[PDB]
């Protein structure tokens, strides 16, 4: 019953932090400690909100996602394992979701994970559930790719499908670049006629 109130207040905190990061000096938003606190809090908030199985949580997490994306882009130089595990569980929930509403969330979580890996070059051994991570990446890639295939074939919404496609492509490219031996990649390609 307090829904609309918390929603508007979150819109307020959002717009506030946005106008802040755009002019951090005027806001005195130079503190990288505060920058990291904000980033982590908004991330975890998107997480907990996107964890509830049973429409409001969707829109809320989507706003939080747009925010976290712009924020990470601006504060990258101020911006990991626990973040990896968290974005993993988050993408997991985003997978157990109905597709027609989870697309933007998948794209966001993907760019987030990409930033998490680009933040520090890591080998597959330091990536928790790296097997499961690549597994899910492959599942999503397969599904969305077949989808975009059918969509392009029926064309005998143009740019977004290709955008997500190229996105997952570069994602898997980096994931494989993390696995030089391909043994896990081998088990994967053996499991999937990608």
């Amino acid at each position: 019953n307090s829904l609309t109130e918390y929603q508007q207040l979150l819109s307020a905190w959002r717009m506030f932090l946005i106008v802040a990061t755009h002019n951090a000096d005027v806001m005195h938003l130079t503190n990288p400690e505060v920058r990291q606190k904000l980033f982590k809090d908004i991330l975890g908030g998107t997480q907990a909100l996107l964890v509830v199985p049973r429409v409001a949580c969707m829109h809320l997490s989507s706003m939080l996602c747009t925010v976290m994306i712009i924020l990470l882009r601006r504060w990258k130089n101020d911006l990991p394992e626990d973040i990896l595990n968290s974005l993993t569980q988050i993408l997991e929930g985003v997978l157990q979701r109905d597709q027609q509403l989870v697309e933007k969330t998948k794209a966001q979580i993907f760019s987030a994970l990409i930033s998490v890996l680009e933040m520090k070059p890591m080998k597959a051994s330091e990536i928790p559930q790296y097997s499961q991570l690549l597994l899910n990446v492959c599942e999503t890639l397969q599904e969305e790719v077949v989808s975009l295939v059918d969509h392009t074939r029926h064309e005998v919404q143009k740019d977004q499908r290709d955008g997500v496609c190229v996105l997952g492509l570069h994602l898997a490219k980096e994931l494989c670049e993390a696995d030089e031996e391909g043994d896990q990649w081998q088990q994967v390609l053996r499991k999937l006629p990608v």
């Binding site: 997991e92 499961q132 597994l135 899910n136 499991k191 999937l192």
Partner: protein
């Protein structure tokens, strides 16, 4: 049981979210403990998949 587990793993071993490898291994080890079977069970069945 080795037959059944070999079968089911042979189907779902490609998707780690429905093939709880570690839980299955611990459970099969506990069951072999319970029934005093050949300690080579778990390795044989799981490698068969």
């Amino acid at each position: 049981l080795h037959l059944k587990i070999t079968s089911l793993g042979k189907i779902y071993a490609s998707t780690p979210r429905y093939f709880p490898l570690e839980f299955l291994v611990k459970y099969l080890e506990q069951q072999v403990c319970n029934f005093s079977w050949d300690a080579g069970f778990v390795t044989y069945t799981m490698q068969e998949i």
